[PDB]
Design an enzyme around this catalytic site. Structure first.
Site, PDB file in Angstrom:
ATOM      1  N   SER A 393     -52.504 -13.176 -61.759  1.00 45.70           N
ATOM      2  CA  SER A 393     -53.280 -14.293 -61.211  1.00 45.70           C
ATOM      3  C   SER A 393     -54.383 -14.651 -62.199  1.00 45.70           C
ATOM      4  O   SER A 393     -55.300 -13.855 -62.433  1.00 45.70           O
ATOM      5  CB  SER A 393     -53.905 -13.908 -59.870  1.00 45.70           C
ATOM      6  OG  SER A 393     -52.902 -13.487 -58.974  1.00 45.70           O
ATOM      7  N   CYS A 562     -55.789 -12.178 -51.205  1.00 43.35           N
ATOM      8  CA  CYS A 562     -55.086 -11.783 -52.422  1.00 43.35           C
ATOM      9  C   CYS A 562     -55.157 -10.285 -52.671  1.00 43.35           C
ATOM     10  O   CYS A 562     -56.192  -9.664 -52.431  1.00 43.35           O
ATOM     11  CB  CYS A 562     -55.682 -12.511 -53.633  1.00 43.35           C
ATOM     12  SG  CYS A 562     -55.014 -11.966 -55.217  1.00 43.35           S
ATOM     13  N   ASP A 607     -51.703 -14.703 -51.683  1.00 44.01           N
ATOM     14  CA  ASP A 607     -51.194 -14.377 -53.002  1.00 44.01           C
ATOM     15  C   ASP A 607     -51.118 -12.861 -53.005  1.00 44.01           C
ATOM     16  O   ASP A 607     -51.974 -12.179 -53.588  1.00 44.01           O
ATOM     17  CB  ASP A 607     -52.125 -14.862 -54.111  1.00 44.01           C
ATOM     18  CG  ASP A 607     -51.571 -14.566 -55.506  1.00 44.01           C
ATOM     19  OD1 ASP A 607     -50.335 -14.606 -55.688  1.00 44.01           O
ATOM     20  OD2 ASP A 607     -52.373 -14.314 -56.429  1.00 44.01           O
ATOM     21  N   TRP A 609     -49.073  -9.517 -54.010  1.00 39.14           N
ATOM     22  CA  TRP A 609     -48.173  -9.118 -55.082  1.00 39.14           C
ATOM     23  C   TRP A 609     -47.091  -8.074 -54.779  1.00 39.14           C
ATOM     24  O   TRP A 609     -46.464  -7.538 -55.695  1.00 39.14           O
ATOM     25  CB  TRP A 609     -49.008  -8.645 -56.266  1.00 39.14           C
ATOM     26  CG  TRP A 609     -50.123  -9.567 -56.577  1.00 39.14           C
ATOM     27  CD1 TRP A 609     -50.145 -10.917 -56.388  1.00 39.14           C
ATOM     28  CD2 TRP A 609     -51.370  -9.224 -57.181  1.00 39.14           C
ATOM     29  NE1 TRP A 609     -51.327 -11.439 -56.841  1.00 39.14           N
ATOM     30  CE2 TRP A 609     -52.100 -10.422 -57.334  1.00 39.14           C
ATOM     31  CE3 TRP A 609     -51.942  -8.019 -57.613  1.00 39.14           C
ATOM     32  CZ2 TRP A 609     -53.371 -10.452 -57.898  1.00 39.14           C
ATOM     33  CZ3 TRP A 609     -53.201  -8.049 -58.174  1.00 39.14           C
ATOM     34  CH2 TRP A 609     -53.904  -9.258 -58.311  1.00 39.14           C
TER      35      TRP A 609
END
Ligand SMILES: Cc1cc2nc3c(=O)[nH]c(=O)nc-3n(C[C@H](O)[C@H](O)[C@H](O)COP(=O)(O)OP(=O)(O)OC[C@H]3O[C@@H](n4cnc5c(N)ncnc54)[C@H](O)[C@@H]3O)c2cc1C
Ligand SMILES: NC(=O)c1ccc[n+]([C@@H]2O[C@H](COP(=O)([O-])OP(=O)(O)OC[C@H]3O[C@@H](n4cnc5c(N)ncnc54)[C@H](OP(=O)(O)O)[C@@H]3O)[C@@H](O)[C@H]2O)c1
Ligand SMILES: Cc1cc2nc3c(=O)[nH]c(=O)nc-3n(C[C@H](O)[C@H](O)[C@H](O)COP(=O)(O)O)c2cc1C
EC number: 1.6.2.4
Length: 610
Positions: A393, A562, A607, A609
């Site tokens: 990111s 995130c 977001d 991962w």
């Protein structure tokens, strides 16, 4: 806008093929399955081929019945919001618009999903349901592979039942080591004709010309590479890649992809244990001169280069790779072991899962633990899967750093049950890049939908534990900028988390500054290990429930989450349910619909991962 290949039915006809397997893949998992299925066609008296649905006109499916015993298989993975993979996009849109009749078409579908997503295998389920509605007949049940368990095993299980069904239906039976490429060692090679690690066109790494992307990455110089965390338990780093002159555009929220190099010592060792000369220049041309993939990777090249830049030599070898290698094991018990790795049950299956997968044994490790396994280097290079790019990111704002792409990453290194210390490919490689001949990182940018609000007055609530702080440093740089520009900026809240302020409080100073200057309305940090009980970002979210509800319901606030842990994302999501339920007020069920409604409205972005 790619130029489509001619009719695949006509191609099948001309090459005597009767089965074609299309793959809806993004990171190669589905491509491998389709290739494995296509190779299986032989063991059953049939002839198949694998293919990328984007390069063809799927409408030709209606002509497939012009081939006796014809069959089409779809290996499709599901992505963002139960969406299709990029390459399967046109196919997906088409399946929605067409009235085409597929009578006489026989198909089978194997979906790649995960159960830790709202719509498990949506793509596979759709392709399988739609093909039937258009008039095609299913020859074998839809495969629902789960990557939350062991997808590889599901594929194996599904497949072990797929072929007997196909043989029974079509009236054909089994027939009891096929190599895809041939080796061509080159003696007189103009050095200028030898690939040395470029991903696309020869010498494209040296002669850089825009536009840059996945197939023509820009070699960005590392102008900075510093340690972000204070302690030494782990190593968190911050890099700055110079994208000047590349004409590359990006905005905070976007990801930056990189092509790494494997550890030279590991490469060197694989060559040593095999007795192969890694510096041999050669090529591996497809034995099927009909195929389009004439090389498993850029050729001509040297083994060293292949093992260094094009092949994956660290992740656990998949069943079929171990299976094809058995033949090179001069010790019976070892040959047997490798051969049984692809079993669908019993000790053989238990061994692959524990000794190979769970232990994270890479290829070199297996060559060491099975001393009799001494395969020829070229057959190995054909078997190993391609080295993938790693994503990160972008940790900077293009309004503040238009000529630089920042990265915030945790170096991977751990003890694997195999007994050895496994190193992360991309993070080790990056960790070693020093600003100095400048250190270059082949990269490109992937646009995402993780974006700051268009209106600068809109409140932003950022939740990023640990390394998840990455995209947010860009958001904060940007919001601070909007203010400097004289604009009016609403509240900007940061809910960050780490283990201890003196161990791994990333960007402690920078964040401190932004807060003092008012760029950050609130700097809320959960120090998970500074007391006996765990304190995470959601506990702070719960603590500020009254204010967050005000910002959300009446301020129009946007939420962003995130990080690595999918469980962390769920815990955070759960807390928002409770906050909404309490201040609506409304029952849990309604609070859930409310929050999921924020998502579909672009007010709750993720977001994650993993
Ligand atoms: C979209 C997206 C955004 C991301 N953003 C970032 C980011 O900004 N910052 C960042 O740090 N990472 C981020 N990543 C992760 C990153 O892409 C890489 O996966 C990560 O950096 C590791 O890559 P590597 O090649 O160094 O390790 P690899 O060689 O790829 O190894 C990774 C694998 O090692 C195994 N593994 C790791 N630790 C253990 C363990 N201790 N025990 C057993 N197995 C283990 C797991 O299978 C893991 O998948 C992101 C990933 C995605 C997809
Ligand atoms: C491969 C590579 C990197 C990370 N990971 C996974 O991703 C996690 C985070 O990686 P990282 O780089 O951010 O380092 P990290 O230090 O693990 O970051 C997580 C931070 O949030 C805390 N946390 C742990 N579980 C949480 C949860 N359920 N909800 C909210 N916060 C939670 C952690 O505290 P505690 O550690 O004190 O619980 C820590 O303060 C790793 O722990 C692991 O699960 C896998
Ligand atoms: C960003 C991302 C989003 C995903 N979204 C979904 C999803 O909505 N549903 C699902 O069932 N699986 C989902 N998956 C899991 C993949 O479908 C699964 O890992 C598949 O094996 C990947 O195949 P590929 O390598 O062929 O693309 C997702 C994976 C990633 C990385």
């Amino acid at each position: 806008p790619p130029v489509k290949e001619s009719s695949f039915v006509e191609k099948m006809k001309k090459t005597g093929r009767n089965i074609i397997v299309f793959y809806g893949s993004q990171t190669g998992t589905a491509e491998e399955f389709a290739n494995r299925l296509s190779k299986d066609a032989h063991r059953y008296g049939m002839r198949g081929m694998s293919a990328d649905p984007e390069e063809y006109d799927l409408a030709d499916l209606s002509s497939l019945p012009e081939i006796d015993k014809s069959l089409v298989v779809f290996c499709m993975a599901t992505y963002g919001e139960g969406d299709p993979t990029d390459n399967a996009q046109d196919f997906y849109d088409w399946l929605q618009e067409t009235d085409v009749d597929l009578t006489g078409v026989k198909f089978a579908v194997f979906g790649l999903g995960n159960k830790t997503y709202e719509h498990f295998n949506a793509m596979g389920k759709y392709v399988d349901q739609r093909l039937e509605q258009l008039g095609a007949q299913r020859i074998f049940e839809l495969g629902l592979g789960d990557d939350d368990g062991n997808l590889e095993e599901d594929f194996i299980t599904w497949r072990e039942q797929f072929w007997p069904a196909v043989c029974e239906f079509f009236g054909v039976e089994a027939t009891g080591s096929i190599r895809q490429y041939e080796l061509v060692v080159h003696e007189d090679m103009d050095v200028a004709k030898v690939y040395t690690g470029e991903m696309g066109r020869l010498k494209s790494y040296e002669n850089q010309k825009p536009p840059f992307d996945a197939k023509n990455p820009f070699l960005a110089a590392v102008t900075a590479n510093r340690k972000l965390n204070q302690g030494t338990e782990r190593h968190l780093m911050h890099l700055e890649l110079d994208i000047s002159d590349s004409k590359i555009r990006y905005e905070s929220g976007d990801h930056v992809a990189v092509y790494p190099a494997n550890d030279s010592a590991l490469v060197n060792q694989i060559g040593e244990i095999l007795g192969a000369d890694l510096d041999v220049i050669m090529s591996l041309n497809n034995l099927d001169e009909e195929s389009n993939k004439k090389h498993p990777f850029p050729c001509p090249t040297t083994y060293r280069t292949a093992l260094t830049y094009y092949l994956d030599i660290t992740n656990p070898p998949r069943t079929n790779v171990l299976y094809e290698l058995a033949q090179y094991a001069s010790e019976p018990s070892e040959q047997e072991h490798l051969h049984k790795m692809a079993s669908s049950s019993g000790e053989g299956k238990e061994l692959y899962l524990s000794w190979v997968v769970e232990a994270r044994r890479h290829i070199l490790a297996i060559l060491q633990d099975y001393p009799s396994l001494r395969p020829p280097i070229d057959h190995l290079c054909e078997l190993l899967p391609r080295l993938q790019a790693r994503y990160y990111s972008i940790a900077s704002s293009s309004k503040v750093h238009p000529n630089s792409v920042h990265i915030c990453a945790v170096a991977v290194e751990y003890e694997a049950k195999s007994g050895r210390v496994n190193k992360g490919v991309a993070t080790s490689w990056l960790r070693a890049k020093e600003p100095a001949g400048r250190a270059l990182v082949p990269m490109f940018v992937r646009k995402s939908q993780f974006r700051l609000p268009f209106k600068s007055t809109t409140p932003v609530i950022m939740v990023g534990p640990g390394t998840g702080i990455a995209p947010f440093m860009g958001f904060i740089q940007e919001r601070a900028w909007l203010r400097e520009q004289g604009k009016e900026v609403g509240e900007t809240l940061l809910y960050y988390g780490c283990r201890r302020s003196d161990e791994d409080y990333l960007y402690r100073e920078e964040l401190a500054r932004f807060h003092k200057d008012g760029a950050l309305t609130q700097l809320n940090v959960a120090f998970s290990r500074e007391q006996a009980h765990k304190v995470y970002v959601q506990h702070l979210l719960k603590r500020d429930r009254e204010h967050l509800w005000k910002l959300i319901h009446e301020g129009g606030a946007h939420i962003y989450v995130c990080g690595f842990a999918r469980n962390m994302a769920k815990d955070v999501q759960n807390t928002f349910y409770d906050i909404v339920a309490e201040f609506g007020p409304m029952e849990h069920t309604q609070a859930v619909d409310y929050v999921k409604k924020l998502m579909t409205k672009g007010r709750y972005s993720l977001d994650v991962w993993s």
